[PDB]
Amino acid sequence: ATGNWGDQKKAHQARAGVSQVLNRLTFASTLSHLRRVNSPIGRDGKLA
DNA sequence: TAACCGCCAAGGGGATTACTCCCTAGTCTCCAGGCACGTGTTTTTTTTTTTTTTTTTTTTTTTTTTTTTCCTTTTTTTTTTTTTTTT
């Protein structure tokens, strides 16, 4: 439910965004959300 | 087989006596290197300030806007009331 993939007390060391709310806007949006792949690199890197 | 002994022969040079001479022993007298004393200028040691690289710390990561979801403790020890058993 929360999305933190680990212990509740030690959720700061756990990854966030593994579990997401399913996008029920269209059928195609649901199919795109069911076939999504996420990179573990954070969204602040200057390396391209 | 020639060491050794006996016998004989020959000669060479150290010992002896005398004359000489010359070099050193001895004694003054002047003076100068040999030596006692003081010290040095290089040599080592110690500080002193810098240098140079390594390591650690710290701070940073464009802005604005709109929706959900989950959570906003929890086990663990101590206390306190209740219930049951016994004389």
* Exposure b/e, A37-46, CB count within 10 A at least 16 = b: eeeeeeeeee
Residue keyed to tokens 């030690």: A10
> Distance in angstroms, CA of A9 to C1' of B81?
35
Q: Are A33 and A22 in contact (CB under 8 A)?
A: yes
Gap between the Cα atoms of A41 and A47, Å rounded: 11
> Distance in angstroms, CA of A9 to C1' of B66?
31
Gap between the Cα atoms of A36 and A32, Å rounded: 6
User: What is the experimental method?
Assistant: cryo-EM
**What residues contact residue A22 under an 8 Å CB cut-off, 6+ apart?**
A30, A33, A34
Gap between the Cα atoms of A45 and A40, Å rounded: 12
Which phi-psi region, left, alpha or beta, contains residue A30 (left: φ > 0; alpha: ψ -120 to 50)? alpha
> Distance in angstroms, CA of A30 to C1' of B41?
99
- What's the DSSP call for residue A11? G
The first and second tokens of residue A6, run together, are 């680990």
Amino acid found at A34: L
Residue keyed to tokens 């199919």: A31
